[PDB]
Amino acid sequence: STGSATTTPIDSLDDAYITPVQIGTPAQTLNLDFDTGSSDLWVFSSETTASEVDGQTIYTPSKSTTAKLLSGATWSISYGDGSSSSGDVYTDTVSVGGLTVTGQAVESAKKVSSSFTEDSTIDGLLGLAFSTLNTVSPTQQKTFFDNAKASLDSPVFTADLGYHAPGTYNFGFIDTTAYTGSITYTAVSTKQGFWEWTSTGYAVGSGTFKSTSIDGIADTGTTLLYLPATVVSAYWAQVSGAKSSSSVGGYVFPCSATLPSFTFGVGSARIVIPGDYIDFGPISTGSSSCFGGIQSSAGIGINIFGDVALKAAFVVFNGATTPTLGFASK
Numbered sequence: 001s002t003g004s005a006t007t008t009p010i011d012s013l014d015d016a017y018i019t020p021v022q023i024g025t026p027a028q029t030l031n032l033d034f035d036t037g038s039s040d041l042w043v044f045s046s047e048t049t050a051s052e053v054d055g056q057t058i059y060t061p062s063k064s065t066t067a068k069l070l071s072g073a074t075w076s077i078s079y080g081d082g083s084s085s086s087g088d089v090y091t092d093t094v095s096v097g098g099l100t101v102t103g104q105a106v107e108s109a110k111k112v113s114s115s116f117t118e119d120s121t122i123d124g125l126l127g128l129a130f131s132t133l134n135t136v137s138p139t140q141q142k143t144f145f146d147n148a149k150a151s152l153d154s155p156v157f158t159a160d161l162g163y164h165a166p167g168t169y170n171f172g173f174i175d176t177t178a179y180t181g182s183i184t185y186t187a188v189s190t191k192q193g194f195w196e197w198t199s200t201g202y203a204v205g206s207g208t209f210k211s212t213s214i215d216g217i218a219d220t221g222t223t224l225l226y227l228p229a230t231v232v233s234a235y236w237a238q239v240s241g242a243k244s245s246s247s248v249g250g251y252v253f254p255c256s257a258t259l260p261s262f263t264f265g266v267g268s269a270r271i272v273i274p275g276d277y278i279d280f281g282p283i284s285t286g287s288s289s290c291f292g293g294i295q296s297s298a299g300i301g302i303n304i305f306g307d308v309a310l311k312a313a314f315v316v317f318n319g320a321t322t323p324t325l326g327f328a329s330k
């Protein structure tokens with residue numbers, strides 16, 4: 001089998017992407033944030049504290065003839081940005097772009113933190129990291145991809161995120177019309193539960209490529225590109241007036257600037273992030289200070305190839321017995 005679903009930016013900055021997902025019988029369609037950096041499929045629901053729901057579409061398990069309480073199971077997750085959610089668990093039928101999984105753990109939120117409440121466009125998350133990170137207790141649950149994998153034509157999914165435009169998540173096949181050139185594959189470590197890989201270096205604008213190993217994760221659920229402070233300083237030094245602001249929480253730059261591109265290495269191949277992808281707009285409405293899309297990972301503890309990087313590529317998440325990651329230009 002295969003599935004194919006369009007993913008759409010939630011706002012004009014590409015702060016995140018939502019993909020429609022059918023849950024239950026009859027189907028309840030929720031718009032979920034597909035997140036290769038976590039491993040829980042959780043939704044706003046009829047159980048979510050009413051004051052914490054503000055415009056989201058909710059899953060109502062009592063209206064699904066295929067929903068079953070997973071008795072005794074609870075979940076609780078805290079994300080790198082400080083947001084969090086928790087609740088109980090149902091199993092139900094879940095379909096993405098025509099690909100159906102029966103018995104999928106659907107984690108129903110009883111509580112969500114303020115950042116989730118305040119984002120009316122995201123009805124929940126669909127985790128696509130390794131199932132060893134799933135938070136359900138006392139019986140850990142499998143991701144949608146892990147449950148689908150044996151049925152898929154090929155044990156893979158692909159992320160093709162758009163810049164200011166819709167893109168695509170495919171399951172079970174590589175669309176050879178969706179990228180240019182060849183796909184370069186690179187090794188993955190699953191030891192931390194992430195799609196963790198090592199970039200071979202970087203360049204800033206038209207500058208010379210610096211060969212250096214950068215270990216990080218491919219994370220569709222993180223907006224920005226977080227890299228070591230040395231790399232990030234070298235980037236922003238090429239932008240007149242750019243500076244790290246402790247009050248704002250990162251690098252800012254004059255909104256009047258034209259940003260240079262940023263290139264990262266995948267083996268001997270190179271992915272170029274255009275400068276415009278690195279502009280996240282005014283720090284507050286009407287400000288002439290703009291927020292940078294490349295930020296330091298110092299204090300996170302891991303480098304993160306988030307949407308800024310991944311949307312410059314066609315990315316293959318290869319879940320074969322030995323997982324790997326592929327990147328192509330597009």
Ligand SMILES: COc1ccc([C@H](N)c2nccn2C)cc1
Pocket residue numbers: 013015223224248280281282283284290291
């Ligand atoms: C301080 O300046 C900022 C802060 C945030 C954004 C943007 N709306 C966003 N939401 C989630 C992630 N990002 C980048 C843009 C400028």
